[PDB]
Amino acid sequence: SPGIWQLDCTHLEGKVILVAVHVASGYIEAEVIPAETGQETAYFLLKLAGRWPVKTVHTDNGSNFTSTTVKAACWWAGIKQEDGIPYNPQSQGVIESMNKELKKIIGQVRDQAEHLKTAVQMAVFIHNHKRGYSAGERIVDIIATDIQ
Amino acid sequence: SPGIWQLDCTHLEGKVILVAVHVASGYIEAEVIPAETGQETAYFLLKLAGRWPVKTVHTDNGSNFTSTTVKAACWWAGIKQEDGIPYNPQSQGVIESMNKELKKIIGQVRDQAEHLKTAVQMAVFIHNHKRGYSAGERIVDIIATDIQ
Numbered sequence: 001s002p003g004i005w006q007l008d009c010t011h012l013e014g015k016v017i018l019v020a021v022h023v024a025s026g027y028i029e030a031e032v033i034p035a036e037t038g039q040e041t042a043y044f045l046l047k048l049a050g051r052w053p054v055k056t057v058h059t060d061n062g063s064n065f066t067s068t069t070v071k072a073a074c075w076w077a078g079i080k081q082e083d084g085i086p087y088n089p090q091s092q093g094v095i096e097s098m099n100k101e102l103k104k105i106i107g108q109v110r111d112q113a114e115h116l117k118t119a120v121q122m123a124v125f126i127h128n129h130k131r132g133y134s135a136g137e138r139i140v141d142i143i144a145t146d147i148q
Numbered sequence: 149s150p151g152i153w154q155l156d157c158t159h160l161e162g163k164v165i166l167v168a169v170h171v172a173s174g175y176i177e178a179e180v181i182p183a184e185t186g187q188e189t190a191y192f193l194l195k196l197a198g199r200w201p202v203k204t205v206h207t208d209n210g211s212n213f214t215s216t217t218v219k220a221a222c223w224w225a226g227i228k229q230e231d232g233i234p235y236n237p238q239s240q241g242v243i244e245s246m247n248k249e250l251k252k253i254i255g256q257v258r259d260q261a262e263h264l265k266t267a268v269q270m271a272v273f274i275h276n277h278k279r280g281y282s283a284g285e286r287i288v289d290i291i292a293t294d295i296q
């Protein structure tokens with residue numbers, strides 16, 4: 001549980017927002033890319049795994065699951081790649097809700113930044129800090145408890 | 149102490165590596181940029197602060213300290229900007245050693261990636277995971293203890 005993350009890809013302003021959600025806490029990391037490719041997903045995972053102890057990743061679609069570059073990055077970083085098939089079906093709805101919510105925050109900050117990428121990072125900040133505990137507090141507690 | 153970070157800028161392959169070090173743990177985040185501008189530093193800080201509870205940043209030089217964009221980002225994210233003047237003089241030597249160490253790791257992984265940015269992220273991973281606790285474990289413990 002402490003090492004489980006879910007990939008999520010959403011669209012805005014003709015661009016792609018790639019999101020990694022720490023399932024147990026709701027904590028996110030996100031980036032803007034021109035389009036989802038195996039290479040971009042692989043690089044994103046390498047960054048993520050150097051920052052948090054990523055054990056398992058539920059990939060967001062079959063193309064990324066299949067991608068030889070994504071597979072290489074998961075091998076390199078010691079990540080077990082799994083499908084993102086929501087056998088538990090509330091999972092989809094939770095991600096759907098998060099995308100809607102992230103887009104709402106992006107709209108609220110949008111005019112404070114020229115570039116979408118900046119607005120996305122502001123939205124990540126607001127999401128992770130919103131409180132009772134915040135997502136940022138929850139992920140730290142979960143992992144700290146796991147270490148010990 | 150749990151919220152104190154230090155900026156560090158180093159050069160390799162004609163490019164700039166921007167590093168943020170969590171002083172109490174030795175944990176790092178890093179990115180490759182073409183050159184160190186206020187805008188790049190500001191964006192880097194926005195990303196950092198959405199991911200970890202950044203209270204104080206010791207900026208790496210006077211241009212970034214002065215930068216109106218860096219100041220804007222610190223205001224937005226609730227970061228106290230301080231100078232990076234090592235009144236305590238072992239500080240500079242610790243950063244020097246870290247840059248040398250990071251460059252060593254980059255050399256060790258360099259041939260496994262086409263692009264410098266990828267090698268830097270591999271180096272971040274190795275640095276943060278190296279154990280007795282790792283930097284990644286230490287930062288989580290420090291912040292978890294602080295929350296309580």
Ligand SMILES: CC(C)C[C@H](CNC(=O)c1ccncc1)Cc1ccc2c(c1C(=O)O)OCO2
Binds near residue numbers: 043259260267
């Ligand atoms: C996971 C590692 C082991 C391999 C991948 C794929 N690279 C190769 O197969 C390769 C190895 C050696 N020489 C050339 C290519 C690295 C990678 C992933 C994602 C990226 C990248 C890179 C990159 O190569 O910089 O660039 C931006 O997005």
Ligand SMILES: CC(C)C[C@H](CNC(=O)c1ccncc1)Cc1ccc2c(c1C(=O)O)OCO2
Binds near residue numbers: 111114115187188222
């Ligand atoms: C910290 C926030 C409040 C302000 C900065 C500076 N921007 C403005 O002053 C501005 C505000 C409104 N319309 C246009 C410009 C945002 C920022 C920081 C770093 C970056 C950026 C941006 C960006 O504007 O996207 O782009 C890549 O590196």
Ligand SMILES: [Cl-]
Binds near residue numbers: 049052277285
């Ligand atoms: Cl880690």
Ligand SMILES: [Cl-]
Binds near residue numbers: 128129198200
């Ligand atoms: Cl946070």
